[PDB]
Design a protein around this ligand. Structure first.
Ligand SMILES: [Cl-]
Ligand SMILES: [Mg+2]
Length: 187
């Protein structure tokens, strides 16, 4: 459909790979750096400055300061996940709530069937179908971050008219221990 035919004409396909240096030690990054899973117990890793030590998060390797970009994530039958973008200068040590006010623009799924935006307060999304693949779209200049069902092109959510000043990284969060991973689709 139009989603498939037009996405690359309007947004540059980002080739996003996960940065293992940023990943909470309870997270596992795959060899090809496209997939993230949770471990039962934290790995023995250094608490280097780049690493999220409290939030179960991992960043992409590259950030954006301009232009239009997109990437797609296979969420599959996962019961829990959150994805989006965050500012380069988010607090990585300790906790602050994941909200736009704190530099996070994300949405996702909890408890299998509750889709929501990670806002203050959290906002419930009514989706006509559960997505299996989600497209994440950034327009830096207009300040829009949009999410689409990458299979049928349906709209999921848009953060509108954000005044970005900082560089933005793709961000991924998983809390639960389940058989299905969260996986980035290659560009
Ligand atoms: Cl949070
Ligand atoms: Mg340790």
């Amino acid at each position: 459909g139009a989603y498939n035919e037009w996405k690359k004409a309007l947004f540059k396909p980002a080739d996003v790979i996960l940065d293992p240096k940023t990943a909470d030690p309870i997270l596992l990054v795959s060899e090809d750096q496209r997939s993230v899973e949770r471990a039962k117990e934290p790995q023995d890793l250094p608490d280097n400055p780049e690493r999220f030590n409290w939030h179960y998060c991992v960043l992409g390797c590259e950030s954006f300061i301009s232009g239009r970009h997109y990437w797609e994530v296979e969420v599959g039958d996962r019961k829990e996940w959150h994805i989006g973008v965050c500012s380069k200068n988010v607090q990585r040590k300790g906790w602050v709530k994941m909200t736009p006010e704190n530099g996070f623009w994300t949405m996702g799924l909890t408890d299998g069937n509750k889709y929501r935006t990670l806002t203050e307060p959290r906002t419930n999304l009514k989706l006509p179908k559960p997505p299996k693949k989600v497209g994440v779209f950034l327009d830096y200049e207009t300040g829009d971050i949009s999410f689409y069902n990458a299979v049928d092109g349906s709209h999921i959510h848009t953060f509108l008219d954000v005044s970005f000043s900082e560089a933005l990284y793709p961000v991924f969060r998983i809390l639960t221990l389940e058989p299905t991973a969260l996986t980035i689709c290659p560009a």
